[PDB]
Amino acid sequence: IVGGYTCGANTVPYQVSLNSGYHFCGGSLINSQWVVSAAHCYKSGIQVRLGEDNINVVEGNEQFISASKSIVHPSYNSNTLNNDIMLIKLKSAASLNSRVASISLPTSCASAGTQCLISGWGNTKSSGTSYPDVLKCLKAPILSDSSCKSAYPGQITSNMFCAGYLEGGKDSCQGDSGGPVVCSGKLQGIVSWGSGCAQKNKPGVYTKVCNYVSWIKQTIASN
Ligand SMILES: NC(=[NH2+])c1ccc2nc(C(=O)c3nc4ccc(C(N)=[NH2+])cc4[nH]3)[nH]c2c1
Ligand SMILES: [Ca+2]
Ligand SMILES: [Cl-]
Ligand SMILES: [Zn+2]
Ligand SMILES: [Zn+2]
Ligand SMILES: [Zn+2]
């Protein structure tokens, strides 16, 4: 997250860190046995770490649980990143408390202008590399689909939306991938892609979760 702030320990209790020996992607807890992340974060051998703040220090509120199964969206296209969403089932149910909580799926899609909260442990430098150990946050508004499409001609589909600032300076970045974009108490997006990080007129592009609620509900009930 570039141009954001330190969230505060466990202030985003639904945020997860996907670890395969190191943190490589974020995710959101949707109920005690399932996590939603991005399909471009798919790997075999994932351990889900809940209640994290500093990912290099065990502070006492963590739960490390291995995944029993991963399900990449049937229509995920790795070249265009269309349908960039995947579900991860935990081997054991997580224990929900104040530090570990699930986030609600949306009942409708959010409007351009709505302010959201994006969080993650990804790179914090636009022109540089600095990976933080504690969770960073960023408040950003959903942009109109026209500014999103004019920034990425022929690359945005109906399953994606842009959020951020066209002036540059604030954005999610590599490492934040698969993590949450929460607007009005609902999970509306998943960190997917963008051009570099925090560049002017290159906002971040997010998976539009409201288009996948039936697929999510149907898949978790059958797995
Ligand atoms: N397991 C891997 N090998 C892997 C996982 C995630 C990755 N993610 C990128 C990436 O290259 C990448 N993820 C991004 C997310 C947001 C933005 C943004 N500017 N908003 C830019 C991004 N670039 N490479 C990745 C490789
Ligand atoms: Ca920790
Ligand atoms: Cl640790
Ligand atoms: Zn990359
Ligand atoms: Zn990524
Ligand atoms: Zn990139």
Cα of 76 from ligand 2 centre, angstroms: 32
Q: Which helix (H) or strand (E) holds 18?
A: strand 15-19
Domains for the chain: give ranges and CATH numbers. 1-12+103-210 (2.40.10.10), 13-102+211-223 (2.40.10.10)
Helix residue spans in the chain (DSSP H): 145-151, 213-221
DSSP string, 37-83: E-GGG--SS-EEEES-SSTTS--S--EEEEEEEEEE-TT-BTTTTBT
Q: Tell me, yes or no, if 40 is annotated catalytic.
A: yes
Pick the residue whose CA is nearest to atom 25 on ligand 1: 174
The response to whether residue 85 sits with its C-beta less than 6 Å from ligand 1 reads: no
CA distance 203 to 181: 14
Q: Tell me, yes or no, if 23 is annotated catalytic.
A: no
CA nearest neighbour of 206 among 109, 130, 69, 126: 109
Q: Tell me, yes or no, if 145 is annotated catalytic.
A: no
Instruction: Name the residue of 18, 23, 40 to mutate for ligand 1: max ligand atoms within 8 A of Cβ.
Output: 40
CA distance 58 to 133: 12
Q: Which atom of ligand 1 is nearest to the CA of 202?
A: 19
CA nearest neighbour of 7 among 61, 54, 60: 54
